[PDB]
Design a protein around this ligand. Structure first.
Ligand code: P1A
Lengths: 234, 224
């Protein structure tokens, strides 16, 4: 590794920890009702996700390099990485024991939970991703680097794409270096395995969009914030 | 076991390179054959290629069918994207037949055109991606242990990891001057997956003669 890369990684791990979970206030401010036990688990999932996206933007905004981009490209990258980066946040709260996700309120959500909320269509693939990630024993630094790498990805309608790509390069170099150091039994293979996650994220992200559109079939309304940032109306 | 030779070979045995015939957008019942021919060759080369990849045929028949059905589009898009590096501003098929923004509808494609050219062709072009690299990436695409319905999961995961190592090794020795080369190659896969997701049907499967379910067309092609 290199004295500078360790600095970058220290920084990323820090930011990752700083924005892992939302405020006590913001969370409690959610569970406060009216409709049945179904439209409730749905409101929790959607509302908490809003905080989740907010946290993602906070993390991205502070990544070295972000401030060197045009406002327009910043918006583009953030819009595009939301649905993807959240899969990481989800995987990090996956419990192998119960094959579930530990939400903020410690309430573990499972297939049944999502199903009850009207989102049983994709939960299987979601849990599958969590297991995949888990089996790879991805650590904090790897997750942080990977998140940065996802955020600085070539996306359509990008003005200074080349500028994004150069920034991504720095994080890719950091990742490789970090992996060579701690991972020896085929470092380069683990490196490729981690990058393969990016390609799988295109699929999960696409599924998220498909599900959002499907909420219209049912009579579920996606919170405006989410519907907007993900352009789930086109 | 993963021989880098076996891989370079499979991509070679299918190495297409003949004319540079622009497609004719007419019902001269000839273009229907130029397209039909390009199709048949493209799809035959797809299975022909897969069988030449190390240990593919050693997989359960059902599994090699699932793997091709799943990777079909990505595999093809990668194929015609790489041999489209020569074309000035167009996509090159197997027949040597080429398509353009306007002559894109027939032959599927169409709305993946702009994106294919800008995120794959141009990228591969300015990166000087060679057939060996392509061969490894396509093989990586093929050995997706996460494809559903697959039995030999772990077997596939291992074969894929071996290809990572081969490509990792190949790039370090071929470009000791370009460290990012490895990562730069692998980062073409997300773009490729995104474009493939925009498809909705298996590319070129309808320009094929007569009717026959996908799993069947594959099942017999893998036996012939
Ligand atoms: C349509 C949209 C709402 C669907 C999103 C769903 O598919 C996801 C990806 O499955 C959502 C549902 C709830 C969820 O937002 C979360 C709840 C938490 O409590 C925490 C909040 C914060 O500490 C996060 O770092 C982790 C976690 C687990 C997030 C991650 C992503 C999850 C698990």
């Amino acid at each position: 590794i290199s004295p500078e890369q360790e600095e970058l990684i220290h920084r990323l791990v820090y930011f990752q920890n700083e924005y892992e979970h939302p405020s006590e206030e913001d969370v409690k401010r959610i569970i406060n009702d009216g409709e049945d036990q179904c439209d409730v688990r749905f409101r929790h999932i959607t509302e908490i996700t809003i905080l989740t996206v907010q946290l993602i933007v906070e993390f991205a905004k502070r990544l070295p390099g972000f401030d060197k981009l045009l406002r327009e490209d910043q918006i583009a990258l953030l819009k595009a990485c939301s649905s993807e980066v959240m899969m990481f946040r989800m995987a990090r709260r996956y419990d192998v024991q119960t094959d579930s996700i530990l939400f903020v309120n410690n309430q573990p959500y499972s297939r049944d939970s999502y199903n009850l909320a009207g989102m049983g269509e994709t939960i299987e693939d979601l849990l599958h991703f969590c297991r995949t990630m888990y089996s790879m024993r991805v650590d904090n630094a790897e997750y942080a680097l990977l998140t940065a790498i996802v955020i600085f990805s070539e996306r359509p309608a990008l003005i200074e794409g080349w500028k994004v790509e150069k920034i991504q390069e720095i994080y890719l170099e950091a990742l490789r270096a970090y992996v060579d150091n701690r991972r020896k039994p085929k470092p380069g293979t683990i490196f490729a395995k981690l990058l393969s996650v990016l390609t799988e994220l295109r699929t999960l992200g696409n599924q998220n969009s498909e599900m959002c559109f499907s909420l219209k079939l049912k009579n579920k309304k996606l919170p405006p914030f989410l519907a907007e940032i993900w352009d789930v109306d086109l | 076991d993963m021989p880098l030779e076996r891989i370079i070979e499979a991509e070679k045995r299918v190495e297409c390179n003949d004319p540079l015939v622009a497609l004719v957008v007419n019902e001269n019942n000839t273009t229907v054959n130029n397209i039909c021919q390009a199709t048949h060759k493209q799809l035959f080369q797809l299975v022909q290629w897969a069988k030449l990849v190390p240990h593919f045929t050693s997989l359960p028949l059902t599994d090699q069918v699932q793997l091709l059905r799943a990777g079909w589009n990505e595999l093809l898009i990668a194929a015609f994207s790489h041999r489209s590096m020569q074309a000035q501003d167009a996509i090159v098929l197997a027949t040597g037949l080429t398509v353009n923004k306007s002559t894109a509808h027939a032959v599927g494609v169409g709305n993946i055109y702009d994106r294919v050219l800008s995120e794959l062709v141009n990228k591969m072009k300015e990166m000087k991606m060679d057939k060996t690299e392509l061969g490894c990436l396509r093989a990586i695409i093929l050995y997706n242990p996460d494809v559903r319905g697959i039995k030999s999961v772990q077997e596939v995961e291992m074969l894929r990891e071996k290809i990572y190592g081969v490509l990792e090794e190949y790039t370090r020795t071929t470009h000791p001057n370009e460290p990012g080369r490895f990562a730069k190659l692998l980062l073409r896969l997300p773009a490729l997956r995104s474009i493939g997701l925009k498809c909705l049907e298996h590319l070129f499967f309808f320009k094929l003669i007569g009717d026959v379910p996908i799993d069947t067309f594959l099942m017999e092609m893998l036996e012939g």
